[PDB]
Amino acid sequence: EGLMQGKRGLIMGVANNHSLAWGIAKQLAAQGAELAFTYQGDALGKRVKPLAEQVGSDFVLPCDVEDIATVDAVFEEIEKKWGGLDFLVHAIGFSDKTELKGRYADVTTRENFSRTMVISAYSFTEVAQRAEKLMKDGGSILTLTYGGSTRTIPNYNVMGVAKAALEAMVRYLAADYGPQGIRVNAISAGPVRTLAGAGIGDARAIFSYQRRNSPLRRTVDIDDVGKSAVYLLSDLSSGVTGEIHFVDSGYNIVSMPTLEELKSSDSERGE
Amino acid sequence: EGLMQGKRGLIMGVANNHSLAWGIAKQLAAQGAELAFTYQGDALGKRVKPLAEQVGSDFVLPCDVEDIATVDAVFEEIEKKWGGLDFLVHAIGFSDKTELKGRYADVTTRENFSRTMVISAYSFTEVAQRAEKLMKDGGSILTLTYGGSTRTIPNYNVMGVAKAALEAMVRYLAADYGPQGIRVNAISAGPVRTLAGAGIGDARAIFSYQRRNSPLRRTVDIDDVGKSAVYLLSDLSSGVTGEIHFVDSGYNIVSMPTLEELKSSDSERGE
Ligand SMILES: NC(=O)c1ccc[n+]([C@@H]2O[C@H](COP(=O)([O-])OP(=O)(O)OC[C@H]3O[C@@H](n4cnc5c(N)ncnc54)[C@H](O)[C@@H]3O)[C@@H](O)[C@H]2O)c1
Ligand SMILES: NC(=O)c1ccc[n+]([C@@H]2O[C@H](COP(=O)([O-])OP(=O)(O)OC[C@H]3O[C@@H](n4cnc5c(N)ncnc54)[C@H](O)[C@@H]3O)[C@@H](O)[C@H]2O)c1
């Protein structure tokens, strides 16, 4: 009866119970999925193990996607225990925070660019390559992206470049794996804040703008993202592959803020 | 348990058991929805009424969207019998078939342009306007489009122009209605052998191209489309509005046919 009943899959990217990957995990488990989780570092493992237990999983493995040996070992354990995979969720990203402020042109370095590209984008290709060997009967693979890939957002900087590369990977992988019945998609999530308010500093001003000016007049939460993940990972989306699916309260469709905010900014800042 | 349990909605566009609207109706009914139907033309009443009976509905009303009095009469009847709507499905398209063969520039007339625009695009605005008054606590509105809106397809001609206008309406309506909790979306479906579908010249060659060269190597059926409609009309998609959602086997992401087909066409047709 559940949308994922009898399906088994791997969730990469839970750090705590505010993670987008955790919202995805909770919705998948409610729909009957059997889950495995990765965690980055012993400290996070002690957080992820009890969260996994809450949704009925004791299959929790260490992984640092920058160290490909740990990734190989994850899929070796999945093959040993399950022998196959029905789905994979990639919800992993990183960039040096010092380069996520100021202008992209001023702050970005090659060292951060290359590391960001590996962790935030190429790791998706690497785990897709390994998942494919375990999806002989088809499957569904999902990653998380953000609209800074295709429209410029202050401070998002080299992460926007990394997400643009990630979205192209979604397309090439979907074209590669489609004929074997493996679907590859992304959710382009709106900004998420599980904490109250809009926050502090630059980030508060960027977040509150999206809250005030998205069509739904709210930011999505990790349950919205998780329910859309259930759709893309389940047979409901059997016709869908290569899709960059916006789950962002419609924010991507608008050009401008509300008329009330246009007028206040016009008077405050001038011609 | 059903994703649409307790929800009531209107489906416009069933013509027979191959219609996209019918696949949508079957999936919604299987998720617990209570359904109302319109049908175009007296002779279609005897085809739509037994289909609606298969999903437990005899709320079936004539409607020709070109005659706004019949549309008003439908929504008046919904207000009297239900007092409210939870969702609306717009699956209506029309163009003079003589202008869906040949070059767009050679065959299109103003008379067909204006009638195609009213029936295939503006009727969506008209039924959304009427649905809004009956969705006091929110709702979801869905239409169906095709990728000929944004990439040219031979013979699709003024239907592509009408779908481009329809997709803009999805965005403007989503921006208007989002603050009151009404989501507005479209499915861009792959090709399906329907009555309307066969109206395009050389339908067979255009259809088989998408079959052979889509990533999934199949064209979607009305069950694929119906399940995606369940997603967009249900609470699973609570974070989604203004979205042109491709349910087309990934076809929109590719530039070219398969390498095998590229080589055969290269040999057969030359430089
Ligand atoms: N937070 C948002 O508002 C938002 C919006 C849109 C998209 N996203 C994307 O969603 C994904 C999840 O981010 P989040 O917001 O849930 O934050 P998060 O901090 O909870 O999740 C990011 C995860 O990536 C993991 N990670 C980072 N470097 C890694 C490495 N080298 N090896 C293995 N794992 C590594 C972290 O351990 C963490 O579990 C990211 O890709 C992010 O870009 C987030
Ligand atoms: N068939 C495909 O390949 C395809 C692909 C993508 C999108 N679509 C869209 O799906 C929708 C449904 O078409 P279909 O393929 O299911 O074909 P169909 O022939 O089963 O349905 C088209 C419907 O439009 C109705 N209609 C036409 N003019 C009307 C009018 N004046 N008033 C009321 N209803 C009217 C017809 O009665 C019919 O029920 C259309 O918008 C079409 O453009 C179709």
XYZ file of C-alpha atoms and ligand atoms in Angstrom:
630
model
C 0.000 0.000 0.000
C 2.840 2.410 0.778
C 4.385 4.096 -2.243
C 7.805 2.594 -1.458
C 6.680 -0.713 0.020
C 9.382 -3.322 -0.458
C 11.867 -0.837 -1.925
C 15.383 -0.533 -0.513
C 17.574 2.520 -0.913
C 20.565 4.537 0.235
C 20.347 8.059 1.725
C 23.544 10.126 1.615
C 23.673 13.441 3.446
C 21.920 13.216 6.820
C 23.769 15.369 9.363
C 20.989 16.069 11.884
C 17.204 16.218 12.049
C 17.179 19.524 10.122
C 18.886 18.005 7.043
C 16.939 17.899 3.790
C 18.053 14.254 3.581
C 16.359 13.593 6.907
C 13.062 15.010 5.655
C 13.432 12.710 2.661
C 14.232 9.731 4.901
C 11.190 10.286 7.114
C 8.788 10.457 4.162
C 10.341 7.422 2.457
C 10.110 5.368 5.647
C 6.466 6.374 6.136
C 5.819 4.990 2.643
C 7.367 1.621 3.513
C 10.965 2.006 2.316
C 13.836 0.076 3.860
C 16.706 2.517 4.296
C 20.477 2.639 4.561
C 22.356 5.819 5.516
C 25.859 7.155 5.148
C 27.487 9.561 7.577
C 30.564 11.772 7.323
C 32.817 11.253 10.336
C 32.482 9.474 13.665
C 30.823 12.495 15.294
C 27.977 12.586 12.754
C 27.650 8.800 12.902
C 26.606 9.093 16.539
C 23.851 11.479 15.377
C 22.802 9.498 12.307
C 22.609 6.088 14.005
C 19.729 7.042 16.362
C 17.905 8.908 13.581
C 18.161 5.830 11.373
C 16.839 3.699 14.244
C 13.805 6.004 14.536
C 12.802 5.031 10.977
C 13.570 1.334 11.451
C 17.101 1.174 10.001
C 20.288 -0.199 11.553
C 22.200 -0.047 8.234
C 24.476 2.974 8.729
C 27.886 3.317 7.055
C 30.753 5.840 7.125
C 31.484 7.720 3.924
C 33.557 10.742 2.895
C 32.903 11.209 -0.822
C 36.293 12.854 -1.253
C 37.869 9.484 -0.279
C 36.701 7.140 -3.026
C 37.746 4.052 -1.029
C 35.033 4.809 1.539
C 32.481 5.077 -1.291
C 33.569 1.737 -2.766
C 33.188 0.215 0.695
C 29.627 1.559 1.072
C 28.452 -0.112 -2.128
C 30.344 -3.301 -1.295
C 28.400 -3.515 1.970
C 25.117 -2.801 0.179
C 25.859 -5.646 -2.240
C 26.756 -7.967 0.655
C 23.592 -7.237 2.650
C 20.928 -6.474 0.030
C 22.463 -7.636 -3.260
C 20.742 -4.765 -5.020
C 19.407 -1.260 -4.778
C 16.083 0.287 -5.710
C 16.983 3.936 -5.163
C 19.682 6.381 -4.109
C 19.444 9.894 -2.652
C 22.461 12.222 -2.993
C 22.044 15.233 -0.684
C 25.664 16.259 -0.229
C 27.385 19.573 -0.834
C 30.323 21.604 0.372
C 32.291 24.747 -0.336
C 34.677 26.847 1.730
C 32.373 29.251 3.589
C 34.885 32.074 3.118
C 34.118 31.964 -0.617
C 30.327 32.102 -0.062
C 30.423 35.818 0.722
C 31.559 38.785 -1.331
C 31.547 38.714 -5.123
C 32.245 35.402 -6.886
C 34.985 37.089 -8.894
C 36.767 38.484 -5.836
C 36.794 35.510 -3.457
C 36.898 32.307 -5.503
C 40.118 30.272 -5.643
C 41.067 27.304 -7.817
C 41.674 25.113 -4.754
C 38.136 25.703 -3.450
C 36.678 25.439 -6.940
C 38.149 21.999 -7.539
C 37.249 20.647 -4.085
C 33.716 22.059 -4.319
C 33.332 20.485 -7.773
C 34.403 17.050 -6.510
C 32.260 17.008 -3.366
C 29.154 18.874 -4.606
C 29.014 17.598 -8.212
C 31.316 14.753 -9.249
C 30.445 12.649 -6.170
C 26.982 12.355 -7.723
C 28.456 10.782 -10.847
C 30.606 8.489 -8.703
C 27.726 7.174 -6.600
C 25.470 6.892 -9.684
C 28.164 4.808 -11.421
C 28.254 2.458 -8.437
C 24.482 2.350 -7.929
C 23.966 1.351 -11.577
C 25.709 -1.988 -11.009
C 23.171 -2.760 -8.263
C 20.050 -1.654 -10.170
C 19.773 -4.502 -12.688
C 15.946 -4.268 -12.553
C 15.791 -0.481 -12.856
C 15.797 2.102 -10.127
C 15.583 5.781 -9.346
C 18.429 8.154 -8.454
C 17.883 11.625 -7.001
C 20.109 14.605 -6.146
C 19.373 18.001 -4.602
C 20.155 21.264 -6.381
C 19.339 24.974 -6.066
C 18.262 27.668 -8.534
C 21.535 29.578 -8.121
C 22.757 27.278 -10.897
C 20.858 29.211 -13.573
C 20.067 32.608 -12.013
C 22.605 34.543 -9.996
C 22.047 34.696 -6.230
C 24.237 36.886 -3.963
C 26.846 34.926 -1.989
C 25.970 31.574 -3.576
C 29.029 32.133 -5.807
C 30.953 28.958 -6.696
C 28.159 26.748 -5.335
C 26.036 28.088 -8.201
C 28.703 26.934 -10.644
C 28.860 23.526 -8.917
C 25.070 23.135 -9.069
C 25.076 23.984 -12.776
C 27.552 21.164 -13.319
C 25.474 18.860 -11.134
C 22.348 19.558 -13.208
C 24.214 18.733 -16.419
C 25.276 15.458 -14.801
C 21.619 14.712 -14.061
C 20.925 15.090 -17.783
C 23.853 13.030 -19.100
C 23.289 10.273 -16.531
C 19.578 10.136 -17.342
C 20.332 9.776 -21.045
C 22.890 7.027 -20.249
C 20.791 4.979 -17.838
C 17.283 5.528 -19.217
C 17.458 2.537 -21.574
C 18.134 0.213 -18.595
C 15.154 1.647 -16.707
C 17.143 3.754 -14.250
C 15.675 7.241 -13.818
C 17.886 10.159 -12.733
C 16.373 13.424 -11.462
C 17.044 16.403 -9.209
C 14.921 18.436 -6.825
C 15.757 22.128 -6.992
C 14.724 23.018 -3.462
C 13.902 26.460 -2.208
C 15.840 27.710 0.801
C 14.931 25.752 3.913
C 15.064 26.934 7.513
C 13.821 24.588 10.221
C 14.860 27.163 12.824
C 12.514 30.047 13.589
C 12.761 33.411 11.857
C 14.862 34.297 8.834
C 18.220 34.227 10.652
C 21.193 36.617 10.852
C 23.398 38.707 8.563
C 23.435 38.568 4.769
C 21.757 35.159 4.857
C 18.729 36.567 6.670
C 18.186 39.229 3.996
C 18.508 36.664 1.194
C 16.261 34.123 2.905
C 13.526 36.577 3.900
C 13.378 37.920 0.345
C 12.564 34.439 -0.943
C 10.017 33.917 1.835
C 8.208 37.222 1.169
C 8.235 37.028 -2.603
C 7.662 33.375 -3.487
C 4.166 32.706 -4.879
C 3.243 30.478 -1.907
C 4.496 33.198 0.499
C 6.375 30.560 2.484
C 9.637 28.688 2.162
C 9.454 24.945 1.675
C 10.259 22.709 4.611
C 11.967 19.362 4.727
C 8.600 17.574 4.561
C 7.739 19.349 1.276
C 11.126 18.263 -0.084
C 10.676 14.740 1.275
C 7.238 14.296 -0.286
C 8.573 15.403 -3.662
C 11.455 12.969 -3.176
C 8.946 10.170 -2.540
C 7.301 11.043 -5.859
C 10.542 10.988 -7.871
C 11.845 7.799 -6.192
C 8.527 5.924 -6.460
C 6.683 4.414 -9.408
C 4.439 7.504 -9.432
C 7.145 9.212 -11.524
C 7.661 6.269 -13.896
C 7.561 8.656 -16.872
C 10.023 11.210 -15.426
C 13.771 11.298 -15.955
C 16.408 13.984 -16.451
C 14.149 16.513 -14.752
C 15.270 19.473 -12.644
C 12.104 19.617 -10.528
C 11.572 22.889 -8.639
C 10.220 22.481 -5.102
C 10.620 26.108 -4.132
C 7.110 27.541 -3.591
C 7.185 28.862 -7.164
C 10.025 31.303 -6.451
C 11.829 30.491 -9.695
C 8.929 31.756 -11.845
C 8.887 35.368 -10.620
C 11.003 38.252 -11.838
C 10.332 40.843 -9.161
C 9.171 41.187 -5.560
C 5.561 42.068 -4.697
C 4.184 45.402 -5.848
C 4.190 46.672 -2.255
C 7.912 45.891 -1.975
C 8.676 47.356 -5.417
C 7.111 50.627 -4.306
C 8.830 50.777 -0.916
C 12.230 50.006 -2.483
C 11.571 52.573 -5.226
C 10.911 55.294 -2.674
C 13.769 54.184 -0.395
C 16.478 53.706 -3.014
C 15.378 55.948 -5.875
C 15.732 55.854 -9.638
C -4.642 6.255 3.013
C -5.408 7.301 -0.555
C -3.516 10.422 -1.580
C -6.782 12.129 -2.613
C -9.078 10.836 0.143
C -11.908 13.270 0.817
C -10.999 15.466 -2.172
C -13.452 16.521 -4.886
C -12.468 17.778 -8.292
C -13.473 18.474 -11.867
C -11.938 16.814 -14.926
C -12.390 18.547 -18.278
C -11.347 16.758 -21.449
C -12.333 13.085 -21.390
C -13.262 11.963 -24.899
C -12.786 8.178 -24.685
C -10.794 5.563 -22.795
C -7.507 6.675 -24.426
C -7.716 10.339 -23.346
C -5.027 11.717 -21.050
C -7.903 13.048 -18.916
C -9.183 9.501 -18.516
C -5.845 8.155 -17.301
C -5.747 11.063 -14.857
C -9.309 10.250 -13.738
C -8.521 6.570 -13.105
C -5.454 7.325 -10.988
C -7.265 10.014 -8.973
C -10.209 7.692 -8.360
C -7.839 4.938 -7.211
C -6.442 7.397 -4.659
C -9.934 8.117 -3.328
C -10.967 11.256 -5.225
C -14.607 12.112 -5.885
C -14.898 13.192 -9.512
C -16.995 15.385 -11.795
C -16.604 15.369 -15.593
C -17.414 17.564 -18.557
C -17.827 16.432 -22.147
C -17.829 18.328 -25.430
C -20.766 17.683 -27.710
C -23.966 15.702 -27.435
C -22.491 12.577 -29.049
C -19.736 12.358 -26.423
C -22.200 12.146 -23.528
C -22.790 8.453 -24.220
C -19.028 7.785 -24.242
C -18.010 9.777 -21.155
C -20.959 8.766 -18.941
C -20.111 5.015 -18.865
C -16.447 5.840 -18.247
C -17.340 8.080 -15.311
C -19.548 5.263 -14.014
C -16.479 2.983 -13.854
C -14.954 5.324 -11.257
C -18.192 5.785 -9.299
C -19.352 9.093 -10.766
C -22.527 10.247 -12.481
C -21.697 13.963 -12.039
C -21.232 14.466 -15.795
C -22.092 17.715 -17.585
C -21.883 19.064 -21.150
C -19.399 21.863 -21.717
C -17.938 23.566 -24.783
C -15.359 26.038 -23.487
C -15.877 28.229 -26.539
C -19.433 28.881 -25.248
C -18.819 30.518 -21.890
C -22.467 30.082 -20.865
C -21.938 26.310 -20.693
C -18.827 26.798 -18.525
C -20.747 29.039 -16.116
C -23.451 26.371 -15.942
C -20.895 23.720 -14.987
C -19.463 25.782 -12.138
C -22.932 26.821 -10.974
C -23.801 23.122 -10.711
C -20.602 22.375 -8.779
C -21.377 25.185 -6.353
C -24.884 23.823 -5.754
C -23.963 20.142 -5.413
C -20.566 20.413 -3.676
C -20.174 24.037 -2.586
C -16.450 23.854 -3.241
C -13.629 22.353 -5.270
C -10.342 20.793 -4.226
C -8.799 20.453 -7.687
C -9.372 21.047 -11.385
C -7.894 19.257 -14.415
C -7.860 21.101 -17.768
C -7.155 18.611 -20.592
C -8.551 20.471 -23.583
C -6.847 21.311 -26.855
C -8.026 22.003 -30.383
C -6.796 23.303 -33.698
C -7.996 22.968 -37.286
C -6.210 19.810 -38.471
C -5.559 21.350 -41.910
C -3.147 23.762 -40.199
C -1.251 20.933 -38.441
C 0.298 19.736 -41.712
C 2.794 21.701 -43.776
C 4.899 24.637 -42.677
C 3.496 26.814 -39.890
C 4.085 29.885 -42.056
C 2.338 28.411 -45.094
C -0.848 27.032 -43.520
C -1.773 29.096 -40.450
C -4.679 31.541 -40.660
C -5.823 34.224 -38.245
C -9.220 32.559 -37.825
C -7.656 29.292 -36.709
C -5.061 31.108 -34.608
C -7.693 32.944 -32.599
C -9.956 29.922 -32.134
C -7.001 27.697 -31.176
C -5.847 30.295 -28.630
C -9.279 30.545 -26.991
C -9.922 26.803 -26.772
C -6.383 25.557 -26.100
C -5.059 28.375 -23.915
C -7.493 31.019 -22.703
C -10.100 28.469 -21.563
C -7.554 27.463 -18.909
C -7.557 31.002 -17.535
C -11.362 31.012 -17.667
C -11.776 27.808 -15.683
C -9.037 28.821 -13.246
C -10.863 32.114 -12.646
C -14.035 30.197 -11.830
C -12.242 27.521 -9.801
C -10.651 30.185 -7.587
C -14.033 31.283 -6.223
C -14.680 27.670 -5.126
C -11.247 27.060 -3.572
C -11.581 29.153 -0.405
C -9.166 26.948 1.585
C -6.709 26.295 -1.239
C -6.553 23.757 -4.011
C -4.579 22.557 -6.995
C -5.117 23.319 -10.698
C -3.511 21.356 -13.523
C -3.291 21.666 -17.306
C -1.534 19.602 -19.974
C 1.051 20.988 -22.398
C 3.626 19.631 -24.844
C 7.270 20.439 -25.469
C 6.492 21.910 -28.888
C 5.911 25.116 -26.923
C 9.643 25.758 -26.507
C 11.309 23.544 -29.169
C 10.027 23.320 -32.717
C 8.344 20.126 -33.865
C 7.295 19.663 -37.517
C 3.560 20.131 -38.160
C 2.777 21.015 -34.522
C 2.622 24.604 -35.862
C 0.095 26.900 -34.127
C -0.501 24.334 -31.375
C 3.070 25.035 -30.299
C 2.298 28.752 -30.168
C -0.837 28.007 -28.127
C 1.062 25.783 -25.702
C 3.657 28.538 -25.206
C 0.841 30.883 -24.242
C -0.707 28.240 -21.993
C 2.576 27.779 -20.113
C 2.846 31.532 -19.534
C -0.691 31.431 -18.112
C 0.405 28.685 -15.703
C 3.120 31.018 -14.402
C 0.967 34.162 -14.154
C -1.908 32.274 -12.497
C 0.491 30.564 -10.074
C 1.881 33.959 -9.078
C -1.649 35.386 -8.642
C -3.180 32.495 -6.703
C -0.199 31.252 -4.670
C -0.785 33.579 -1.702
C -4.234 32.052 -1.155
C -2.909 28.496 -1.243
C -3.990 27.594 -4.779
C -1.219 25.851 -6.728
C -1.186 25.954 -10.532
C 0.962 23.600 -12.626
C 1.227 21.812 -15.959
C 2.382 18.396 -17.108
C 4.308 18.502 -20.367
C 3.466 14.988 -21.526
C 5.216 12.846 -24.070
C 3.232 11.741 -27.113
C 0.167 9.504 -26.670
C -1.994 7.997 -29.436
C -5.212 9.908 -28.678
C -7.935 11.314 -30.904
C -6.389 14.785 -30.743
C -2.917 13.262 -31.030
C -3.661 11.818 -34.454
C -4.609 15.258 -35.833
C -1.011 16.153 -36.662
C 0.311 15.333 -40.111
C 2.747 12.396 -40.263
C 1.827 11.519 -36.690
C 3.429 8.085 -37.012
C 6.926 9.334 -37.871
C 6.823 12.073 -35.252
C 5.634 9.614 -32.582
C 8.140 6.870 -33.380
C 11.022 9.351 -33.264
C 10.186 10.052 -29.629
C 9.752 6.333 -28.922
C 13.154 5.387 -30.323
C 15.111 8.345 -28.990
C 13.697 9.177 -25.537
C 16.008 8.144 -22.660
C 13.429 5.648 -21.371
C 13.051 4.247 -24.946
C 9.270 4.233 -24.567
C 6.546 6.828 -24.819
C 4.498 7.543 -21.718
C 1.015 6.131 -21.344
C -2.024 7.687 -19.719
C -1.128 5.884 -16.463
C 2.289 7.568 -16.305
C 0.565 10.907 -16.889
C -2.220 10.105 -14.432
C 0.203 9.215 -11.636
C 2.097 12.471 -12.150
C -1.248 14.282 -12.030
C -1.973 12.585 -8.691
C 1.331 14.001 -7.474
C 0.630 17.579 -8.606
C -2.993 17.570 -7.441
C -2.227 15.964 -4.067
C -0.556 17.219 -0.901
C 2.651 15.458 -1.974
C 3.382 18.508 -4.150
C 2.617 21.114 -1.458
C 5.870 22.895 -2.295
C 5.308 23.015 -6.076
C 3.611 25.718 -8.135
C 4.116 27.411 -11.481
C 5.905 24.287 -12.682
C 6.000 22.976 -16.253
C 6.663 19.367 -15.240
C 7.976 17.082 -17.990
C 6.511 13.569 -18.006
C 7.989 12.655 -21.366
C 10.464 9.794 -20.792
C 13.260 12.379 -20.624
C 12.862 13.324 -24.278
C 13.231 17.069 -23.646
C 16.808 16.652 -22.335
C 18.360 15.151 -25.480
C 19.667 16.997 -28.500
C 20.002 14.135 -30.962
C 18.724 10.646 -31.733
C 20.683 7.624 -30.507
C 24.166 7.059 -31.895
C 22.873 4.050 -33.857
C 20.195 6.233 -35.483
C 22.665 9.078 -36.089
C 24.912 6.735 -38.046
C 22.111 5.200 -40.086
C 20.774 8.663 -41.010
C 24.300 9.854 -41.819
C 24.782 6.953 -44.217
C 21.310 7.236 -45.764
C 21.069 11.022 -46.076
C 24.682 12.200 -46.300
C 26.539 15.361 -45.344
N 19.600 23.992 2.872
C 18.941 24.534 1.854
O 18.218 25.537 1.982
C 19.114 23.914 0.493
C 18.370 24.374 -0.587
C 18.494 23.764 -1.822
C 19.359 22.708 -1.969
N 20.079 22.279 -0.914
C 21.079 21.107 -1.067
O 20.634 20.034 -0.283
C 21.772 19.229 0.103
C 21.719 18.937 1.583
O 22.068 20.124 2.327
P 21.259 20.521 3.644
O 20.667 21.865 3.464
O 20.377 19.387 3.994
O 22.427 20.615 4.735
P 23.208 19.525 5.599
O 24.375 20.153 6.268
O 22.241 18.910 6.624
O 23.555 18.378 4.504
C 24.763 18.363 3.716
C 25.377 17.002 3.906
O 26.551 16.852 3.075
C 27.475 16.085 3.812
N 28.803 16.206 3.231
C 29.549 17.339 3.032
N 30.768 17.108 2.605
C 30.824 15.726 2.507
C 31.856 14.842 2.140
N 33.085 15.232 1.793
N 31.586 13.519 2.164
C 30.366 13.118 2.532
N 29.317 13.856 2.906
C 29.616 15.159 2.878
C 27.344 16.605 5.235
O 27.901 15.694 6.176
C 25.820 16.690 5.347
O 25.288 15.445 5.784
C 23.019 19.987 -0.376
O 23.513 19.439 -1.593
C 22.494 21.408 -0.596
O 23.231 22.091 -1.604
C 19.973 22.849 0.302
N -1.782 13.222 -27.056
C -0.569 13.717 -26.857
O 0.434 13.270 -27.430
C -0.439 14.944 -26.007
C 0.819 15.277 -25.521
C 0.963 16.325 -24.635
C -0.140 17.044 -24.256
N -1.351 16.722 -24.749
C -2.563 17.556 -24.379
O -3.431 16.771 -23.608
C -4.755 17.348 -23.707
C -5.768 16.257 -23.946
O -5.634 15.760 -25.295
P -5.541 14.195 -25.573
O -4.246 13.873 -26.214
O -5.943 13.464 -24.353
O -6.664 13.993 -26.691
P -8.237 13.735 -26.637
O -8.765 13.784 -28.029
O -8.569 12.461 -25.873
O -8.669 14.967 -25.706
C -8.792 16.325 -26.170
C -10.046 16.834 -25.515
O -10.260 18.227 -25.839
C -11.658 18.395 -25.878
N -12.010 19.670 -26.481
C -11.638 20.172 -27.700
N -12.236 21.295 -28.020
C -13.057 21.551 -26.930
C -13.982 22.575 -26.660
N -14.278 23.556 -27.520
N -14.638 22.532 -25.481
C -14.389 21.523 -24.641
N -13.553 20.493 -24.796
C -12.916 20.565 -25.971
C -12.157 17.175 -26.630
O -13.553 16.970 -26.430
C -11.329 16.089 -25.937
O -12.045 15.579 -24.819
C -4.665 18.427 -24.800
O -4.459 19.715 -24.222
C -3.398 18.031 -25.554
O -2.776 19.132 -26.205
C -1.525 15.690 -25.595
